[PDB]
């Protein structure tokens, strides 16, 4: 339905192939990770210079 | 007079026997004059970062 993904459900897909070393792998994506329509980065760089540089 | 480049010394003696104590309570004038270079340095970064004093 258009409710779980719209809610932001983080879906995951697992697959097992013989050729793979671990024999198992997976990926995942949610609403945001699904082509983020917009970022919300708010990084803060505290103490840009001190002791270390 | 006291600051006339003269190391003023008292002449107090004793009653039992004359003992002139010419102790130089005056500062040593002359010898050599030089500007006392003064540098005023601030606290280290670590001290301030510790935020104690």
PDB file of C-alpha atoms in Angstrom:
ATOM      1  CA  UNK A   1       0.000   0.000   0.000  1.00  0.00           C
ATOM      2  CA  UNK A   2       0.912   3.678  -0.281  1.00  0.00           C
ATOM      3  CA  UNK A   3       0.879   3.974   3.527  1.00  0.00           C
ATOM      4  CA  UNK A   4       3.879   1.987   4.783  1.00  0.00           C
ATOM      5  CA  UNK A   5       6.325   3.526   2.312  1.00  0.00           C
ATOM      6  CA  UNK A   6       4.727   6.947   2.766  1.00  0.00           C
ATOM      7  CA  UNK A   7       4.976   6.402   6.524  1.00  0.00           C
ATOM      8  CA  UNK A   8       8.716   5.915   6.044  1.00  0.00           C
ATOM      9  CA  UNK A   9       8.967   2.145   6.374  1.00  0.00           C
ATOM     10  CA  UNK A  10      12.556   0.937   5.968  1.00  0.00           C
ATOM     11  CA  UNK A  11      12.239  -2.027   3.620  1.00  0.00           C
ATOM     12  CA  UNK A  12      15.026  -4.574   3.209  1.00  0.00           C
ATOM     13  CA  UNK A  13      15.754  -7.101   0.460  1.00  0.00           C
ATOM     14  CA  UNK A  14      17.902 -10.172   1.151  1.00  0.00           C
ATOM     15  CA  UNK A  15      19.277 -12.607  -1.420  1.00  0.00           C
ATOM     16  CA  UNK A  16      21.371 -15.773  -1.191  1.00  0.00           C
ATOM     17  CA  UNK A  17      23.626 -16.788  -4.084  1.00  0.00           C
ATOM     18  CA  UNK A  18      26.193 -19.574  -4.189  1.00  0.00           C
ATOM     19  CA  UNK A  19      28.870 -17.431  -5.844  1.00  0.00           C
ATOM     20  CA  UNK A  20      28.725 -14.857  -3.047  1.00  0.00           C
ATOM     21  CA  UNK A  21      31.455 -15.449  -0.418  1.00  0.00           C
ATOM     22  CA  UNK A  22      29.167 -15.028   2.588  1.00  0.00           C
ATOM     23  CA  UNK A  23      26.444 -16.774   0.535  1.00  0.00           C
ATOM     24  CA  UNK A  24      23.992 -14.097   1.735  1.00  0.00           C
ATOM     25  CA  UNK A  25      23.649 -10.352   1.170  1.00  0.00           C
ATOM     26  CA  UNK A  26      21.038  -7.640   1.522  1.00  0.00           C
ATOM     27  CA  UNK A  27      20.219  -4.030   0.751  1.00  0.00           C
ATOM     28  CA  UNK A  28      17.630  -1.659   2.167  1.00  0.00           C
ATOM     29  CA  UNK A  29      15.877   1.646   1.565  1.00  0.00           C
ATOM     30  CA  UNK A  30      13.171   3.750   3.217  1.00  0.00           C
ATOM     31  CA  UNK A  31      11.101   6.730   2.103  1.00  0.00           C
ATOM     32  CA  UNK A  32      13.914   9.196   2.807  1.00  0.00           C
ATOM     33  CA  UNK A  33      16.689   7.015   1.380  1.00  0.00           C
ATOM     34  CA  UNK A  34      14.428   6.525  -1.633  1.00  0.00           C
ATOM     35  CA  UNK A  35      15.796   9.508  -3.544  1.00  0.00           C
ATOM     36  CA  UNK A  36      15.630  12.130  -0.758  1.00  0.00           C
ATOM     37  CA  UNK A  37      13.430  14.885  -2.165  1.00  0.00           C
ATOM     38  CA  UNK A  38      15.364  17.304   0.059  1.00  0.00           C
ATOM     39  CA  UNK A  39      18.279  17.092   2.461  1.00  0.00           C
ATOM     40  CA  UNK A  40      18.209  18.478   5.997  1.00  0.00           C
ATOM     41  CA  UNK A  41      21.928  18.578   6.741  1.00  0.00           C
ATOM     42  CA  UNK A  42      22.694  20.681   9.810  1.00  0.00           C
ATOM     43  CA  UNK A  43      26.326  19.812  10.464  1.00  0.00           C
ATOM     44  CA  UNK A  44      28.125  21.710  13.224  1.00  0.00           C
ATOM     45  CA  UNK A  45      31.916  21.926  13.523  1.00  0.00           C
ATOM     46  CA  UNK A  46      32.596  22.704  17.175  1.00  0.00           C
ATOM     47  CA  UNK A  47      36.048  23.959  18.211  1.00  0.00           C
ATOM     48  CA  UNK A  48      37.287  24.437  14.664  1.00  0.00           C
ATOM     49  CA  UNK A  49      40.767  25.114  16.070  1.00  0.00           C
ATOM     50  CA  UNK A  50      42.146  24.110  19.452  1.00  0.00           C
ATOM     51  CA  UNK A  51      44.859  21.849  20.853  1.00  0.00           C
ATOM     52  CA  UNK A  52      44.884  19.775  17.660  1.00  0.00           C
ATOM     53  CA  UNK A  53      45.132  22.818  15.383  1.00  0.00           C
TER      54      UNK A  53
ATOM     55  CA  UNK B   1      69.493  62.884  48.509  1.00  0.00           C
ATOM     56  CA  UNK B   2      68.620  59.217  49.072  1.00  0.00           C
ATOM     57  CA  UNK B   3      67.983  58.673  45.339  1.00  0.00           C
ATOM     58  CA  UNK B   4      71.090  60.706  44.421  1.00  0.00           C
ATOM     59  CA  UNK B   5      72.918  57.628  43.148  1.00  0.00           C
ATOM     60  CA  UNK B   6      74.022  56.933  46.727  1.00  0.00           C
ATOM     61  CA  UNK B   7      73.643  53.606  48.530  1.00  0.00           C
ATOM     62  CA  UNK B   8      72.463  55.159  51.787  1.00  0.00           C
ATOM     63  CA  UNK B   9      73.730  53.241  54.824  1.00  0.00           C
ATOM     64  CA  UNK B  10      72.738  53.854  58.429  1.00  0.00           C
ATOM     65  CA  UNK B  11      75.304  54.266  61.205  1.00  0.00           C
ATOM     66  CA  UNK B  12      73.550  52.864  64.279  1.00  0.00           C
ATOM     67  CA  UNK B  13      76.039  51.767  66.948  1.00  0.00           C
ATOM     68  CA  UNK B  14      75.870  49.844  70.225  1.00  0.00           C
ATOM     69  CA  UNK B  15      76.063  51.120  73.793  1.00  0.00           C
ATOM     70  CA  UNK B  16      78.536  48.470  74.977  1.00  0.00           C
ATOM     71  CA  UNK B  17      80.941  49.059  72.071  1.00  0.00           C
ATOM     72  CA  UNK B  18      80.852  51.330  68.991  1.00  0.00           C
ATOM     73  CA  UNK B  19      79.705  49.055  66.141  1.00  0.00           C
ATOM     74  CA  UNK B  20      78.544  51.132  63.152  1.00  0.00           C
ATOM     75  CA  UNK B  21      76.339  48.826  61.070  1.00  0.00           C
ATOM     76  CA  UNK B  22      76.556  50.435  57.623  1.00  0.00           C
ATOM     77  CA  UNK B  23      73.955  48.073  56.197  1.00  0.00           C
ATOM     78  CA  UNK B  24      72.887  49.117  52.697  1.00  0.00           C
ATOM     79  CA  UNK B  25      69.112  49.387  53.033  1.00  0.00           C
ATOM     80  CA  UNK B  26      69.305  51.597  49.935  1.00  0.00           C
ATOM     81  CA  UNK B  27      68.915  49.979  46.531  1.00  0.00           C
ATOM     82  CA  UNK B  28      71.984  49.559  44.282  1.00  0.00           C
ATOM     83  CA  UNK B  29      72.125  52.658  42.085  1.00  0.00           C
ATOM     84  CA  UNK B  30      74.160  52.568  38.891  1.00  0.00           C
ATOM     85  CA  UNK B  31      76.099  49.424  37.983  1.00  0.00           C
ATOM     86  CA  UNK B  32      74.158  49.068  34.731  1.00  0.00           C
ATOM     87  CA  UNK B  33      70.759  50.230  33.483  1.00  0.00           C
ATOM     88  CA  UNK B  34      68.628  48.228  31.076  1.00  0.00           C
ATOM     89  CA  UNK B  35      65.012  48.306  29.994  1.00  0.00           C
ATOM     90  CA  UNK B  36      63.182  45.332  31.546  1.00  0.00           C
ATOM     91  CA  UNK B  37      61.451  43.828  28.520  1.00  0.00           C
ATOM     92  CA  UNK B  38      57.982  42.689  29.558  1.00  0.00           C
ATOM     93  CA  UNK B  39      55.874  40.186  27.639  1.00  0.00           C
ATOM     94  CA  UNK B  40      52.304  39.418  28.703  1.00  0.00           C
ATOM     95  CA  UNK B  41      51.308  35.910  27.589  1.00  0.00           C
ATOM     96  CA  UNK B  42      47.804  34.428  27.811  1.00  0.00           C
ATOM     97  CA  UNK B  43      46.728  31.041  29.180  1.00  0.00           C
ATOM     98  CA  UNK B  44      47.110  27.913  27.092  1.00  0.00           C
ATOM     99  CA  UNK B  45      44.225  26.540  25.043  1.00  0.00           C
ATOM    100  CA  UNK B  46      44.043  23.458  27.268  1.00  0.00           C
ATOM    101  CA  UNK B  47      43.564  25.563  30.401  1.00  0.00           C
ATOM    102  CA  UNK B  48      40.600  27.478  28.961  1.00  0.00           C
ATOM    103  CA  UNK B  49      39.081  24.373  27.356  1.00  0.00           C
ATOM    104  CA  UNK B  50      39.148  22.615  30.729  1.00  0.00           C
ATOM    105  CA  UNK B  51      36.830  25.456  31.843  1.00  0.00           C
ATOM    106  CA  UNK B  52      37.962  25.380  35.462  1.00  0.00           C
ATOM    107  CA  UNK B  53      40.318  28.373  35.631  1.00  0.00           C
TER     108      UNK B  53
END
